[PDB]
Amino acid sequence: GLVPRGSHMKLYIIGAGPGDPDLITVKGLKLLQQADVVLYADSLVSQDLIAKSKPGAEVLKTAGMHLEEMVGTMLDRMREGKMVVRVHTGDPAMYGAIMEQMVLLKREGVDIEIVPGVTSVFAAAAAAEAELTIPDLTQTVILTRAEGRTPVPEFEKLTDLAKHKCTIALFLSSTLTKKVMKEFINAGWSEDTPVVVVYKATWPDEKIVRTTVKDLDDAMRTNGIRKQAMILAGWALDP
Amino acid sequence: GLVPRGSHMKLYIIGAGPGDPDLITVKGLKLLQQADVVLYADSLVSQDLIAKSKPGAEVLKTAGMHLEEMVGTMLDRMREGKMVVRVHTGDPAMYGAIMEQMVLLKREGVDIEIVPGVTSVFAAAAAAEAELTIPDLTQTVILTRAEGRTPVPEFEKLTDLAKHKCTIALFLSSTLTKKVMKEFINAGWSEDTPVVVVYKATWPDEKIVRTTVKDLDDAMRTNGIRKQAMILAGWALDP
Numbered sequence A, B: 001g002l003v004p005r006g007s008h009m010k011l012y013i014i015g016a017g018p019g020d021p022d023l024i025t026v027k028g029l030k031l032l033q034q035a036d037v038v039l040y041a042d043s044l045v046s047q048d049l050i051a052k053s054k055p056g057a058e059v060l061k062t063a064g065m066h067l068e069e070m071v072g073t074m075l076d077r078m079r080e081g082k083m084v085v086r087v088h089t090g091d092p093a094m095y096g097a098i099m100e101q102m103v104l105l106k107r108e109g110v111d112i113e114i115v116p117g118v119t120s121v122f123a124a125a126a127a128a129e130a131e132l133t134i135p136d137l138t139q140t141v142i143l144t145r146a147e148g149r150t151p152v153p154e155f156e157k158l159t160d161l162a163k164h165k166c167t168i169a170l171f172l173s174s175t176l177t178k179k180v181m182k183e184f185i186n187a188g189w190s191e192d193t194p195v196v197v198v199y200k201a202t203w204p205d206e207k208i209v210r211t212t213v214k215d216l217d218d219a220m221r222t223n224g225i226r227k228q229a230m231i232l233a234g235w236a237l238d239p
């Protein structure tokens, strides 16, 4: 491009997708292939996607890094004229923890561009061959998380949310299935209501488990699923 | 590939994304480029995405086609040994109306593969630079539609859903903003609660409107948005 526009002062926040390297958007892949600096969280974002960055890119893992340092590193590379990008699992809007870095960067005059991606809810619906909305059955899909030690807001408890009897998709809840069950049975759900668990959707080790509220905790333990699972609950998951 | 596996007896149900041709997944684009037969719904799925199909592909519009005919055409092409694919807006799980064709096709022994895509909810969150989940504010995102003449299930009315005070994302509701407002104010929401409307997210004519419950219907009419809008309501949309 011919003329300087201060385009290094930008962060691209790219929705990698659920894990298969080909479920990134075409646009996210173009940016990932041009970036000079690639930030991401190990074993959640596939290594085969991150290896698509160009020879010479600086690839940084952010897990063991505090907020101000990560941000300070991003700005240093930006101010050296580098194209900097941060790759997030699924779509960043769902528990991507992007707001804190955005607020600090915009105060330093950085532009943000978020590139939307395939969220794991939808990757799991697809793998399960389910549409989450069924005319005359349910027209609402509730994205949430079960409460473990970190409480959820007062008006968002799983039981209250489950009184709507629609489709419920649980993030960050694979080791909270006893709590999920209790919450569903206290809302009045049948213990036979369908629950589909998709562990690592789209990865080579994906597992699809079909079960019900009553066997949820046993199907989790029996199948060894203790992380990275998307739980789809409702009559739209009836096979 | 060396040996016959009955691989023509398959339907790929591909999540095109919100509209920009580059927000299709890399995988959906590969399938779209190989397909012999491409089915889709005009002006909702961009022409520039559908033009990526290969020279010679048969491109069929399905709007003016009944269920059994579309299905009967899909099977005829399958049984001639053709690779057949159907391209749906956003992600097919959200009001993609895929279940009816799946049930009829599986009875004829067809395999289904759904390729998840970027739903318009997430395309609109990105355009608005918003994360929909904020620790200590909201951990739940409710995907639904306002009720016009086609009623929603009894336990899924907008007001009841809005008592959770979380993020609410309305599909198919751009000309129902008076009903949405009433439903939000009856649930007790402040009339100042942020509402972001993204009309045609990612298309060349995208418009981002920032407003509140109280000015929702006027901001829609004033901006001329009467279709293809994604309404994100909640304190997570506070700019």
Ligand SMILES: Nc1ncnc2c1ncn2[C@@H]1O[C@H](CSCC[C@H](N)C(=O)O)[C@@H](O)[C@H]1O
Pocket: A018, A019, A089, A090, A091, A092, A093, A094, A095, A096, A118, A119, A120, A121, A123, A124, A170, A171, A172, A173, A174, A198, A199, A200, A201, A202, A203, A227, A228, A229, A230, A231
């Ligand atoms: N490939 C995958 N399969 C199943 N669940 C997944 C997943 N990737 C992420 N998750 C879900 O996401 C949680 C992490 S929170 C990050 C979610 C991501 N923003 C997205 O849109 O998918 C996990 O606990 C699990 O609930």
Ligand SMILES: Nc1ncnc2c1ncn2[C@@H]1O[C@H](CSCC[C@H](N)C(=O)O)[C@@H](O)[C@H]1O
Pocket: B018, B019, B089, B090, B091, B092, B093, B094, B095, B096, B118, B119, B120, B121, B123, B124, B170, B171, B172, B173, B174, B198, B199, B200, B201, B202, B203, B227, B228, B229, B230, B231
């Ligand atoms: N590009 C876009 N911008 C805004 N809303 C859009 C959109 N594409 C589809 N929609 C939303 O989707 C509705 C059609 S129902 C089909 C939705 C699609 N399955 C998806 O996941 O996005 C529209 O009324 C509008 O609410």
